[PDB]
Structures are given as structure tokens and as C-alpha cells.
Amino acid sequence: MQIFVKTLTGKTITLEVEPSDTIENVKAKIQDKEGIPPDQQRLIFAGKQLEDGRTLSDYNIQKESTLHLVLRLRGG
């Protein structure tokens, strides 16, 4: 299945995923494709944090769905 990751919004990208795959592996796919450590990342589902819930199947996240990705630079 496939979702619309909104990286701070403005940049909307499709990401291919399986529902049973871990949100740990989703953080790793973001980290290794975009070159950014997971501590800087936060996943925002309509103001709710995605945390301790395990997979896209656990939350019933599905397809063409608009998950926000907050990322934090250590100043600049």
C-alpha cells in the first residue's frame, strides 16, 4: 500500500509500505533515504503522535493517506 508523507507540508511524497511493517522500519526508511536521524523526526497523525503503536495495521493507516513528518534541525 502507499501513503502521502507530508514532510513539514509543502513537500508531499508517496511512500510505499506494507501494513504489517514496523513504524521503526518506517523511521529507518525515512532516515536512510533522506539522511536524517530518527531522534530529529516526529510522526504527526492529525495532531496525535504515532508512538508505542507498532505498525500501520495497528493504527489502521491505509492508502492515499496524509501522515505529517516533523523534523528538527539542531539550530542553524
Binding site: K6, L8, T9, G10, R42, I44, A46, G47, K48, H68, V70, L71, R72, L73
Partner: protein
């Protein structure tokens, strides 16, 4: 004036689910309009 930056940044925050203009204003005024130091405040600091 630069108030247009702050205003449009309240809407970039609205898209993420920060559905309040006044908290978003105070979070940006606390920095000078740096939005990444504003977002962490809206997360709880």
C-alpha cells in the same frame, strides 16, 4: 510589515493539526519567526 510571515506560518502549522492561531503566534513570537523552535513548543516543549 513581516507579520505576513508569521500569519502564513500559523497555516503551515494548521495543516499539521495545530488548530489554534494564538498558541501558534506565541510559539513563533518566542523565537522571532523561526518555525522549528516554534513546533517543539506546540509538542509540549
Amino acid at each position: 510589515g513581516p507579520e505576513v510571515r508569521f500569519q502564513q506560518q500559523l497555516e503551515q502549522l494548521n495543516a499539521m493539526g495545530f488548530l489554534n492561531r494564538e498558541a501558534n503566534l506565541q510559539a513563533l513570537i518566542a523565537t522571532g519567526g523561526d518555525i522549528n523552535a516554534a513546533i517543539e513548543r506546540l509538542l509540549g516543549s
